[model samples]
Target: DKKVDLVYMNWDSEVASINVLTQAMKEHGFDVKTTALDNAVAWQTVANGQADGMVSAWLPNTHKTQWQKYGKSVDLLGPNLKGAKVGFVVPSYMNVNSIEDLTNQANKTITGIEPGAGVMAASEKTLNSYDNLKDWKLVPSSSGAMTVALGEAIKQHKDIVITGWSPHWMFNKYDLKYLADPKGTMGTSENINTIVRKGLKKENPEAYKVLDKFNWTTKDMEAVMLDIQNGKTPEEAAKNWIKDHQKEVDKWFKGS
Candidate 1:
């Protein structure tokens, strides 16, 4: 009977995602919880035993630092989703088409997520690598703030850039483009993983089995992501989500 807490934030897809898993675990007769902590604390939550684990472990690149720091203590589970990417993004209408073109824009600012974000950390390094970034600014904000600001800016047709990632509902809602990462500063495509506290397998094998079996596609997530955007709680959105995917659900329970 471990208290479950999946590290999470306001990012839409993962919010919907983790909630679905929560519901699924509960259906499996397990109690689970979620924490909206910033990514750093979320990672540490699992490692310190204050929380169970996180569904948002972006790895081999983005969360590599965390894995290196806490890998020994946490059990990394299945890549819940794959082919997710991160980078600087701009509304497609922006005249400038590249990260290198930011200096030429009237506003030399880039909105980013939590300051603790590895994406933001990589962005700082990316900015430093170019001489033209001397006047550019990377503003730190939550994902919600960034999304709203982006929407408003696009309405006004203003030039702007922000830290961006995939499986995001925003990509479906807006016409946006990831600025070419010629310098390769923004880490390449990463798999979204599930992480749980160590010893969970021995303590609660059933929950661990489901978690280990928890893999889905971006398209599957997109359905729920859009449902959440349209006003369903992640819990409500995910409950019936799997009914249509009976075949897929079967995979998680094979031989059980």
Candidate 2:
């Protein structure tokens, strides 16, 4: 029997999602092949018809610019996860309550993930929008570097600011708060969307339906993220999370 081929384009930080998607696809008999790439590369893979789909699209605002450029050529689906947010974040102990406070801080730098990350780009745009932040800078670093920096600062209860997002494990590990983006450069509250090459539904209705119906809450995603962050293999973490949350999982694929 020939195995059905399904390619998945993903980002480095979405380990949990990749694991869950791969496992689900395998269980459904797809010979899933995942290519872990940066945000830009992942989008490019799908847009160029080099890959079948990706579930890491942060759409309508955060990634709107890219979506507008490539959306017409790809199939964009409803959100895979909701209540996702991206913005400047600080430890809960920080005196700051909003984006405006960053201007006066001595840190003078906001740690950021990959240089091409939507959040990093938005942070730069934000700095340009605000006169106070014109002198402020966004320090580009890998996700691991930023998280390590945040962890170090947290250990000392020091004030630190960084570009942050929701459904990420850091929130659960640290008491953090997303500062108010008065200028909204980080975009409105957004959700993670699923994207596929056009004609996916027509070619693989079963897989397409499964992808379309797949939805998880912030809490659900966080559980998997945290587990993976704590050293669990992404596959193991997702499987364990699903096992513990069968009721929720069943709800996602109830009728189908």
Candidate 3:
């Protein structure tokens, strides 16, 4: 038999879920490889068939335009997880409870991940819709960089807002609130799905089975991400999670 090769295109946010998927694949005796990229690169790689799959497709809303363009070229293997969300966030100390309040602050800038990221586009569209935020800016930066800025702002108890998402380790590290987007630019809800190149089902049934079976809640994902963020390797953190959540893992792979 030929050695099956699997390439996963993922982002930092989905590190935990990717770790779990990779570990399961290796344990089930399959040859697998993974490549981590930021959002735009990840989507393009899978769309152009440069990579096999990814467990981080935040679908139907967050990355709707990307999915419409490349979904036909890729095989969507169903959602690896659900109930995901993304939007602007602020520290608990920020007196504001909603996005509309941003106009009062002189620096009404929403710190964003990257220039090409869908979230940045959505936020830009959002600002366009609201007269109050006409002068607001979507400041572009990497996720790490944005978070570092957020940390500094928080330490000083200063006001700050940024493009934020769920199922991330930062939520665990800080007390934050996703400012209510009354204008609905952020899209109210979303799901994280799995995607693969065409013909994955026929190509690698075992790995496919494991990937298809993988699912978890926001809390479950956050725990693993926090472990890795706290200094443990991705594999080590995933292993610890699996060991502690044996019952859940059993349920995930019950028939297999």
Candidate 4:
């Protein structure tokens, strides 16, 4: 019924859900569009009102600091999916079971996504909580690059650690374990929120209604994500997933 330009960060899972919601809004006759960027750009785009909203805000812990700073400006539409988790992850073959165990075993290094990622910021704080990590270098790379490095390390059976989160396809693709965060450096499990700028409802009521009604499970998202990973474009995967779950999505329009 109206225009909606959404922005999102580079997390695979979030982007997948964003694509689903974008298509759902399009079904409601919304001229929906999206942009991909770093976490700061995505969250600030919504908070500063440069963009209407985003389906990528990790809440309670992942993006806690940013949330405290920008929460006053954006309307948190609540979880689009639940049961999310984040922490330092390593190949199961690595001797590390707890984050503290990483010591010299981690090769005194940790892989991270973009420097601006909330998980990166959280991992940086984790460095201070643990003396071993305080000196470990956090190499900032794109998620794809980090995953590739992790893949290579795993194939060679070398120990490596990366700032990681759950509901990620990597967890399914490889045998991985989250190093225990005994010191509470990495925040607890959290939800991915759909946040929009103030006045979004007033500007695009019907689209707002659909977005407000939007919610799904972790499995619902992986279907699309795994499809995309298997070779479908986001649009192709989104269309197919919609066909498979149109009945569930119909409730969004029905506002039930």
Models 1 onward score TM values of 0.71, 0.77, 0.76, 0.71
Q: Give the TM-score of candidate 3.
A: 0.76
Top candidate, metric TM-score: 2
Find the 10 residues in a row with the least total lDDT in model 2. 1-10
- Number of backbone clashes in candidate 4: 1
Question: What is candidate 4's lDDT per residue for 1-256, written digit by digit as tens?
Answer: 4788888887678768888887877886778778898887778888888898887887786788789889999999888788887789999887768877666875688889988887888898998789767668888988889989998999898888998987877876788889889898788777888888898889877667777878888777877887888789988888888889999887777654
After aligning candidate 4 to the native by TM-score, how far in Å is the CA of 164 from where it should be? 1.8
- State, as a TM-score between 0 and 1, how close model 2 is to the true structure: 0.77
Writing each residue's lDDT as its tens digit, candidate 2 over 160-189 gives 889998878898788899998878888888
Task: Give the candidates in order of lDDT, highest first.
Answer: 4, 1, 2, 3
Error of 3 at 53 (Å): 5.4
Off by more than 4 A, model 1:
1-14, 25-54, 61-70, 95-97, 101-103, 113-117, 131-142, 156-158, 196-205
Highest-lDDT candidate: 4
Residue 141 displacement in candidate 4 (angstroms): 5.6
Candidate 2 stretches greater than 4 Å from native:
1-4, 25-52, 61-70, 102-106, 113-117, 131-137, 196-203
Question: What tens-digit string does per-residue lDDT give for candidate 3 at 49-90?
Answer: 677678888888767878888888888888767777778888
- Number of backbone collisions per candidate: 0, 0, 0, 1
Question: Compared with the true structure, what per-residue lDDT tens digits does model 1 show for residues 94-163?
Answer: 7777777666574788889899887898889988886777788889999889989998989998877899
RMSD of 4: 4.2
Ranking by TM-score: 2, 3, 4, 1
